[PDB]
Amino acid sequence: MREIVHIQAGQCGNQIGAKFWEVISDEHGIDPSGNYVGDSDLQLERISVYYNEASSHKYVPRAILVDLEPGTMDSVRSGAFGHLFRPDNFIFGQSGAGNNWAKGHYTEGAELVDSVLDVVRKECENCDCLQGFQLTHSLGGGTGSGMGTLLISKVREEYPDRIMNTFSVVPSPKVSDTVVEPYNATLSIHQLVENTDETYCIDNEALYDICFRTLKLATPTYGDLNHLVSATMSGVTTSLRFPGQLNADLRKLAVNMVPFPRLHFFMPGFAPLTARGSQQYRALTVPELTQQMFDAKNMMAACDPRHGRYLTVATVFRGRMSMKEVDEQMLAIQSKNSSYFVEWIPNNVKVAVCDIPPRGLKMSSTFIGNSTAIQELFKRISEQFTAMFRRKAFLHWYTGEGMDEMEFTEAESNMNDLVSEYQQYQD
Amino acid sequence: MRECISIHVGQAGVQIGNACWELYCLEHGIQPDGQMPSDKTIGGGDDSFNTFFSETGAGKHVPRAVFVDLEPTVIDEVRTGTYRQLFHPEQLITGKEDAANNYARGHYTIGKEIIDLVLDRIRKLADQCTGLQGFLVFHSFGGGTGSGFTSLLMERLSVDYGKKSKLEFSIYPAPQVSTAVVEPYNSILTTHTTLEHSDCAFMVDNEAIYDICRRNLDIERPTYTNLNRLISQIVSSITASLRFDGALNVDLTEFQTNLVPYPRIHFPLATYAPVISAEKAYHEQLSVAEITNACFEPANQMVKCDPRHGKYMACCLLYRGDVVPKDVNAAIATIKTKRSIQFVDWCPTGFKVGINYQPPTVVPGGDLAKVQRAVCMLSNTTAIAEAWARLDHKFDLMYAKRAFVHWYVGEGMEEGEFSEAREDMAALEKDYEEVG
Ligand SMILES: COc1ccc(C[C@@H]2NC(=O)/C=C/C[C@@H]([C@H](C)[C@H]3O[C@@H]3c3ccccc3)OC(=O)[C@H](CC(C)C)OC(=O)[C@H](C)CNC2=O)cc1Cl
Ligand SMILES: Nc1nc2c(ncn2[C@@H]2O[C@H](COP(=O)(O)OP(=O)(O)OP(=O)(O)O)[C@@H](O)[C@H]2O)c(=O)[nH]1
Ligand SMILES: Nc1nc2c(ncn2[C@@H]2O[C@H](COP(=O)(O)OP(=O)(O)O)[C@@H](O)[C@H]2O)c(=O)[nH]1
């Protein structure tokens, strides 16, 4: 039972992670009090990886929540699992998360992260075995990225023989405002690349473009985003939570998935996307499910995979259907869409099936891809930063608290390097 | 007296070990208690089956063998299974970290930090026995454990026991049940470091077994249960010679001599006719000549290859029950009539034969249909070129893009080393091409 320590920080990170944890607990059926009220014994067979044990035999999920605005538990209790997290490790800041990198990444907050690292180190050893670390946040500026990549650097320092993972969200100038973020993102990911190899780029722009246009919305609120993300990035780890064919561990997930030590930006999707409606819907069929699988609109990234090629694909079906027939349409897709995949990497279709269905849904399937497609999103975020770097806007605070211009230029150089790598490996 | 030791490395290896060992215990009249067949009940036996099992004070016939893996996922999963007391508790090792399809992980990261315990246990087991002949290896190409740990372990064995032979039961991997795309990499990385220590290897093909379990065994979704049971049956059909009686292919040295001309080339094909599915009562009957002549068909050849397009080197068989040599020789003569088979131009190539006096034993609660006739061809046909070259081709496709190289590099391999291994096996393909 290789346990996982969950790291989590930031206003958006906590918002997404609360609903994610609620979804996973509900699917596993443990009561919001913290006791097993599930409906079978296939739940607690090895699930200690996410849920530890208390003295009174009640379970206890392990996940750290930190920030720099003092009120987090005041906002963490906004759902249904406030006291559920152990009530001694809600380390809180003092100021807030203005969109200022290095205001958490160099001087203040960095003072707090030493104690944070001490606490997480103390937290880790109690388990029987360690799997690694995985982190949920957004690349959003304002203590959201600083603390994130900072703690990434120190955890990678302390445990080189484990695996990182980021559930970060790329900001976008369609849903949001306070436009200094391109700096924050394109600078933090600049060392996220060297510091981590396991990433999911849930494009907020794509989430809006699919949630407001063709999902019957008028003003997408933050809970609206939280529904879709707490669906997809909660179903992404069912393979970890549930035994099955592709039980691959973090290290093994990587070795099956990441060819090169940098080209590791997975772009996920989820075929039965659903806005918040209590009624489930009419039923869907397996070929329809696996066809909405590659729905370009369905993609949680900013591209249509038809416009590019894949490298290493996974898939996790869920429900009760034809177990052994899924290979038929897997090979059908392979045969009719050879151009979509690449010849450099044969048999890039690792597939598996999980018996359990999700909450409020019978037939569904979480998806993971790895394609050249995210070159489009990176070109977007690179132009949406370079077209404004010429005016040197707002770099006063950054240049005052400990950055410099050469750092900005070298970050742009690194990201042009990544887009070049994607381009050439597409060529 | 004589004896032998079977090693078990990897999840697949230990699953097949459980299946095979349970079948063997069933076959000899032994029971999950092993009360007594007809013998002294303490240090008894005296037939050939003693070479696998040895009686304790209770006459239990403990199988002096071990199971090894780097994660307590499957080892424990069967340690509290049917044969809990058949094997010795604290005689099944459990690793901690899975090799995770990484050959270097089993070669220089975690297996290297535990191999000492495995060596101590196997050496103690050898001290317990008195008549060791060699070793039986159950591993797989694809897995990091069953390749890296396998290679390193057998290297240690060849270092300390430099005389005895050894036989490898590996599993040639298939895309249809593939759980990695680093699988050719691990396969090459281990096999390029086997010939120097390996003596003979019986590799089984997943796609071939899958096609057997479907096209004739009436399955559509075969799990590891179906494939594993079928391969356990075929492995029993191979080793029955060592299990019972003096006949063709009794000893491991005899195995290799009857089979292996040249030390580098020691990959022999294998077949086993009865694949008749299940409780489907009777559509036809059985016949010695029928199964013998149908053996040459590419139906049941353990590994997918085209033998009729390649020159042979030897031919051995084996039969279960319903013994009468005369019609056996008549069947040999009938199939002898040179339809398209060929042989070696510089040595006699007779169809060596050794018969056994026991019909096949089928699992008491499984798919296979009870039969009483059987054949088992251990042909040393050169046509395994095709399969090896296919794997090599799948390998060198992904080397122009330097794919996945860093993952192995990070633990102590070398980038250009892979080119050396690829040239080694290109030369081995040339070696197959030499025979013409
Ligand atoms: C043309 O000039 C413009 C002027 C305004 C606008 C719109 C205007 N803003 C920006 O894009 C400016 C971004 C900078 C950023 C700088 C680069 C980071 O170090 C800052 C910092 C943070 C905390 C403490 C100390 C320093 O500051 C801020 O974080 C503050 C927020 C609060 C905390 C003052 O600023 C806003 O965002 C304001 C208050 C919210 N509103 C807006 O949407 C657009 C343009 Cl283009
Ligand atoms: N016939 C058969 N093949 C199996 C079985 N288990 C695994 N395989 C195949 O063996 C290959 C790899 O072996 P695995 O057991 O998956 O790997 P492993 O030895 O556990 O290696 P690690 O996962 O790296 O520790 C794949 O082609 C699997 O499909 C089994 O019970 N029977
Ligand atoms: N995906 C997602 N993005 C959000 C949410 N709320 C705000 N955002 C945007 O994504 C980024 C959130 O990260 P961050 O800036 O660290 O949030 P902060 O801690 O409130 O400053 C910001 O640029 C926001 O504009 C949310 O609930 N989900």
Residue numbers in the entry:
A (entry chain B): 1 to 427
B (entry chain O): 1 to 436
Sentences from the paper on this structure:
The cryptophycins (Cps) are a class of macrocyclic depsipeptide natural products derived from species of marine cyanobacteria in the genus Nostoc. Cps destabilize microtubules, thereby preventing correct mitotic spindle formation and inhibiting cell proliferation. At high concentrations, Cp-1 and Cp-52 destabilize microtubules and cause the formation of curved tubulin complexes and rings. Cp-1 and Cp-52 bind primarily to a site on β-tubulin that overlaps with, but is distinct from, that of maytansine as well as those of rhizoxin and PM060184.
Therefore, we have determined the structures of Cp-1–HeLa tubulin and Cp-52–HeLa tubulin rings, to a resolution of 3.4 and 3.3 Å, respectively, by cryo-EM and further characterized the binding interactions by molecular dynamics (MD). The interactions of Cp-1 and Cp-52 with tubulin are very similar at the current resolution. The contact area of Cp-52 with β-tubulin is 380.9 Å2 (339.2 Å2 for Cp-1), similar to that of maytansine (313.2 Å2) and rhizoxin (333.6 Å2) but less than that of PM060184 (489.3 Å2). The contact areas of Cp-1 and Cp-52 with α-tubulin are 339.0 and 373.0 Å2, respectively. The calculated dissociation constants for Cp-1 and Cp-52 are pKd = 7.24 and pKd = 7.09, respectively. Key residues (buried surface area >40%) at the interfaces are the same for both Cp-1 and Cp-52. There are also conformational differences between Cp-1-bound and Cp-52-bound tubulin in that α:H10 of the latter is shifted out of register, relative to the former, by 2.4 Å (i.e., half a turn) toward the exterior of the protofilament.
